[PDB]
A paper describes a structure:
Deposition of α-syn amyloid fibrils in Lewy bodies (LB) and Lewy neuritis (LN) is a common histological hallmark of Parkinson’s disease (PD) and synucleinopathies such as dementia with Lewy bodies (DLB) and multiple system atrophy (MSA). Accumulating evidence shows that α-syn amyloid fibrils serve as prion-like seeds for the propagation and cell-to-cell transmission of the pathological entity of α-syn. Several single point mutations and genomic duplication or triplication of [name], the gene encoding α-syn, have been identified to be causative to the familial forms of the diseases with a broad spectrum of distinctive clinical symptoms. α-Syn hereditary mutation [name] was originally identified from a Spanish family with autosomal dominant parkinsonism.
In this work, we determine the cryo-EM structure of the N-terminally acetylated [name] α-syn (Ac-[name]) fibril at an overall resolution of 3.37 Å. The density map showed a right-handed helix with a width of ~10 nm and a half helical pitch of ~68 nm, which is consistent with the AFM measurement. The fibril contains two protofilaments that intertwine along an approximate 2-fold screw axis. The high quality cryo-EM density map allowed us to unambiguously build an atomic structure model for the Ac-[name] fibril. This structure represents the fibril core (FC) of the Ac-[name] fibril consisting of residues 45–99 out of a total of 140 amino acids of α-syn, which is slightly smaller than the Ac-WT FC consisting of residues 37–99 formed under the same condition. In contrast, in the Ac-[name] structure, this segment forms a β hairpin and extends from the FC-C with interactions to the side chains of Q62, T64, and V66. In the Ac-WT fibril, α-syn subunits fold in a flat layer; in contrast, in the Ac-[name] fibril, β6 and β7 of the FC-C swap to the next layer to form inter-molecular side-chain interactions within the same protofilament. In contrast, in the Ac-[name] fibril, the [name] mutation breaks the salt bridge of E46-K80, which results in the breaking of the other two essential electrostatic interactions (K58-E61 and K45-H50-E57). Alternatively, in the Ac-[name] fibril, K80 forms inter-molecular salt bridge with E61 of the opposing α-syn subunit to involve in the fibril interface, and K45 directly forms salt bridge with E57 to stabilize the β-hairpin conformation of the FC-N. The exposed segments 74–79 of opposing α-syn subunits form typical class I parallel in-register homo-steric zippers to mediate the inter-protofilamental interactions. Thus, the relatively loose packing of the Ac-[name] fibril in comparison with that of the Ac-WT fibril may explain the decreased stability and increased sensitivity of the Ac-[name] fibril to the environment, which may associate with the pathology of this PD familial mutation.
Author numbering:
A (entry chain D), B (entry chain B), C (entry chain F), D (entry chain C), E (entry chain A), F (entry chain E): 45 to 99
Write the structure that this text describes.
Amino acid sequence: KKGVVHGVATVAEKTKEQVTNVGGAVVTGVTAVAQKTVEGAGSIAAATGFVKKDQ
Amino acid sequence: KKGVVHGVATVAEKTKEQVTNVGGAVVTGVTAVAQKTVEGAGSIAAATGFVKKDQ
Amino acid sequence: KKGVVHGVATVAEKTKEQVTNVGGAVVTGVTAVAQKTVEGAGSIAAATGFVKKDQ
Amino acid sequence: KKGVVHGVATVAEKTKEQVTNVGGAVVTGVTAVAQKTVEGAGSIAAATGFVKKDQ
Amino acid sequence: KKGVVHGVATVAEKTKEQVTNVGGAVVTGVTAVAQKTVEGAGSIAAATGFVKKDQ
Amino acid sequence: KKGVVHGVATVAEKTKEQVTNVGGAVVTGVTAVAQKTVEGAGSIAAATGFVKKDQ
């Protein structure tokens, strides 16, 4: 076989899960957050997949 | 076989899970956060996959 | 076989899990955080995969 | 002070939390379950407070 | 002071948490279960407070 | 002071936590279980407070 990509690719066979991202956010997984009190200014209290930027 | 990529690629066969990211965030995994009190200014209380930038 | 990449690639066969990242964050694994009190300014209380930058 | 109980009592002062049970079940706490696949016959997959009886 | 109990009592002062149980189950605490696959017949996969009886 | 109990009592002053149990199960503490695969018939894979009986 032959393949040429520029990116971002994701090429496969017999594949149970696939995610391609440029971004941005993708949430495909099981996630449970139980929480009782959030205070403070400002605290990231429960982050799973996270980025921050400033310019 | 033959392959030429520029990136970012992810090329495979018979593959159960795949993630390609440029970004950005991707959450595909099981995650449980149980939490009772978050205070303070400002504290990253429970971070799983995390980045920070400032300019 | 033949392959030429610029990066970042991830090339394989018969492969159960794959992650490619430029970023950014990717969370694909099982993660359990149980927590009772977070205070202080500012304390990274439970970080699994983490980066920090400042300019 | 004076107190006479038959049970089950729970007597206090200045008290943040209280539970009295005869039973039975009481759930008052933070709880997060994230789960992806349960099989088998029959498996108690994630039990926090649990009892079993048979006669 | 004076106290006479038959049981089950729980008598106190200045007390942050209290549980009285005859039973039965009481869950008051922070609990996080993250789980990906449960199989088998039959396996108690993640038990925190647990009893079993048979007659 | 004077006290007479039959049991089960738990008598105190200035006390941060209290548990009385006849049972039965009580879960009041922080607990995190992260788990990826459970198999077999039948294996107690992660037990914190546990009993078993048979007659």
